[PDB]
Design an enzyme around this catalytic site. Sequence first.
Site: not given
Ligand code: S0D
Ligand code: MG
Lengths: 546, 546
Positions: A184, A334, A465, A523
Amino acid sequence: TLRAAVFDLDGVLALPAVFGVLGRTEEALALPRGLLNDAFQKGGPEGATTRLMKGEITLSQWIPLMEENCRKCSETAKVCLPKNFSIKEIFDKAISARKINRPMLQAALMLRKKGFTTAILTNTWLDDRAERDGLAQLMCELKMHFDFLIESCQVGMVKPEPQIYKFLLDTLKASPSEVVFLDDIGANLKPARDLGMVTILVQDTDTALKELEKVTGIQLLNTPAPLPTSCNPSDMSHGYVTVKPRVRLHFVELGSGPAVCLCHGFPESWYSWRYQIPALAQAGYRVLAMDMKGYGESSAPPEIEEYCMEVLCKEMVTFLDKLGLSQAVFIGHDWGGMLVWYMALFYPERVRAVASLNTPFIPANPNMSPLESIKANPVFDYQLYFQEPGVAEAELEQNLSRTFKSLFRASDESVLSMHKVCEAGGLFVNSPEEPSLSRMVTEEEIQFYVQQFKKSGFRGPLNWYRNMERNWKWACKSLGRKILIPALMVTAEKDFVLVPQMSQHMEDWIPHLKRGHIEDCGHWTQMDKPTEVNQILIKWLDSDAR
Amino acid sequence: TLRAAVFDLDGVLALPAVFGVLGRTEEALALPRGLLNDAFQKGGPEGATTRLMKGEITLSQWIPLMEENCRKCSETAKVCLPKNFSIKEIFDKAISARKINRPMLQAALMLRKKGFTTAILTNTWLDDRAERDGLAQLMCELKMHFDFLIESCQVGMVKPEPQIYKFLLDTLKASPSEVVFLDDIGANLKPARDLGMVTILVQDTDTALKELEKVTGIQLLNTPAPLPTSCNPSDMSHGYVTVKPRVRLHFVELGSGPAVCLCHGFPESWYSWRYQIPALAQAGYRVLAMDMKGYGESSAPPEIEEYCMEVLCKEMVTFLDKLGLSQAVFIGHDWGGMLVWYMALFYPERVRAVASLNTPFIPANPNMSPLESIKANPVFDYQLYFQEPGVAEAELEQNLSRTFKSLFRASDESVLSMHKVCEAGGLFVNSPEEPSLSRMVTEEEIQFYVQQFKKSGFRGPLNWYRNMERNWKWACKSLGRKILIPALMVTAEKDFVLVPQMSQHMEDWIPHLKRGHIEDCGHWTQMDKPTEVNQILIKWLDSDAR
Ligand SMILES: Cn1cc(-c2nc3ccccc3[nH]2)cn1
Ligand SMILES: [Mg+2]
Ligand SMILES: Cn1cc(-c2nc3ccccc3[nH]2)cn1
Ligand SMILES: [Mg+2]
């Protein structure tokens, strides 16, 4: 031809410029036009201000010399300085007034993104004021976006002396005609022009950007909204804590202020928080982004029960104990989302506040085995596929690039339904061998996930799971409690697995629950809508966690 | 025979007990003796308080039930509760009043040190109060000193039910007659006594400790002052940051609050701060204990100039940038001490405050080459020995245990003078092959240093001494400045290398310098006088850094 771009700080990257406040201060106090600027510049190359700018003396040492210069200027102009005239005062105020000029920064970002080498070239000082931290922050935020920051007081040279330009050109490994320099102050531009640099005299930002656009051939003004700053893995502080003899947790750590622990979902990584990490740090938080147990650089023991929610929670508490944190804010997405609700229910004393993206809190049904409960909702059929150890692991590890490129998709891009996955024999049975690349992710980013999952594969992740009954029985112990600490639920409109409607009764168990909602969001919330996520979290953190 | 010791929390490890405040509250408010205690205990095994203690409900949910119990008790005693009678109020106050009972904790520590398994057995609650953090801290501080913490609300069982004792005995892997249990409630002791446990009814602390001493055969009361808590390396969070392509810095990290970065000397380690790390974390600081460049798990490139002060400082600034810290408090000892003074002079904006143990700040002499300056003081002769690359490395690496056992000595234990080291041909020429073990360090602690220096040896560390001219020329640029940020100099009486007298002129360059002095303290300040060091640093941090 142009290969490098150099931005001044005062009046170019940061606004209002401080000479601005010397002008205003004279007026406000009805002194002679320019008197303050005369004091500032007194003695020219040998005066107090040059010595400051060269790093010979600190800002605190210069303050009383500027005073004296202000006395001398006033006596020679036959006026009096007001009572309580305060040089420190005027400057503290001027310095806290200056903010980042956002459109200039984004123009520098874009040029860097198209391959320019970029730098900041500034006359500045060694700042030892009580309040020095405010500028330290501003300089930190700016500097991480540039290849070099060159400060007069660190290199012992000042604009407009021609030596600092030779130092510039030499740091840049570039020749004078490969360089554009915005400033400037026209005097600063004069020597750059002499060596053949393109220069831009910066008055209003928009005209300078127009000149900069015309000179570089790159569109900079009116450009679409940029993504938040992401993280480069090898620039991060990487942290490791052994929570028990077979088990260490890895995390990335950035920022200072209240601890915020981010817990990713399946099948993901600390890196799923790449767009939140710099924003939350920048907002005044200490971010701890986990690799959750099973993933990335955290340990991945094989046994299924090492991944029930009870054990996973106990180990997150151990992680706080060893790090010496009495609490953290827990933010999950998730599976990490489910886990933070359980931290709120079993360890409220350790949780400053809890937020979840996508995962609702639904209290366990003590009259229905969860296998049953699951079978009563077609969208969770794919979880039955996940049960038998080995089956999903072989499909998901078989080709990692395809796995993540199939999973990580925006809501209008999908290539898999989670529909009759058992019946069909696989998650990908009817998706392509070489999926196209989602708009949400680059090829490089997919390959970071690929390289992470080469360490341990999908056994640990899938095991999350594989504890339905065990998690159900533990959750049943919590059925008398409510969640009464500060809590945020964020729903994603187009998450077709964890749908917004599933969260509708949460206020029965969390009476002061706060909400965000993100429209047109699938998601993968954090990378689908990073800008909106950041805004909802930072606003909820500032009001409820701070 | 006795192999385990179990301590109650309320009234045993923490004081005043809360029933204490129910007594006092009745009196203060002139209610009927025991009314509050009747409300508390209403319904016995099925009442609101048992449900709380079992983890069925949270503290916030119980508060309004205790209210109702207090209404019912008052109507049946034909009195009125005062206006503004507040259950939350009484408990918040009662809970923040309780502190750790230091002599009980030290007795538990000692028993643990002689091989006992120790635990805390407590009836407590899931605490979701706005103010929950205060107890979270207290529980954190207590728990790290015990093998187990068993809480009624986490295990779903309560003293005096006999199931929680069976859970206790089973967690302890011990039989009832191998166990002593201290508690302030006799009913709690009753079932432990039934299974054959030694029990101790805790009224005044000193009598319980006398019983505990008599029963264990270990001296616990009137025992000398214990060392501060040390650190076990594999229990720490270990952090790694790449500051440039060949160079990563490792650090141990503990606590939350303002960042405090500890910089060790030659030839040392993050572990030299073992006694400061838990104390400073406990005092409300975020401790970052470095392995300095050249050491331990930080990188150790071979080139001499990789260790000049300029580069070392630039890299500490990069370390803050990548961690996202705009400032830290810098506390150095020995070579780390010299480095923090240079951080204060070249990067004041990044240094919240600066302290040094032993190393004075003496401005460079621009009219005397530092080789000269060195030759003008017999006590620094040994530095000439350090110059020639390879010579000192071979002596110092030749036998690591001997090296550290010779160096790490208290002031009345020495085995080497730093006197005519060149003339004599070595640092250890006239010291023993197998030195005795100093009182300051255990055999294990020496072996931690040994194992650290097996990674890179003494090249990097020695290189810190090999940049005399280069450091002198850089330091000369700073000769106009003063250090005007908050600053602490701590001298060690019997450091015969970095002597207190050498610090005598520091106020000329650091006008508001604060001081500590430690008497009867040799060169290894942190492990020589850990208790006094902690007290001086924490007091200076709290007044000047906070
Ligand atoms: C707690 N929870 C997480 C899931 C879930 N299923 C998926 C299936 C694919 C990708 C991510 C995913 N995340 C379901 N319940
Ligand atoms: Mg300056
Ligand atoms: C900055 N500085 C550090 C020293 C030093 N010499 C030593 C000799 C032996 C052990 C530790 C030692 N520390 C001198 N000056
Ligand atoms: Mg008690």
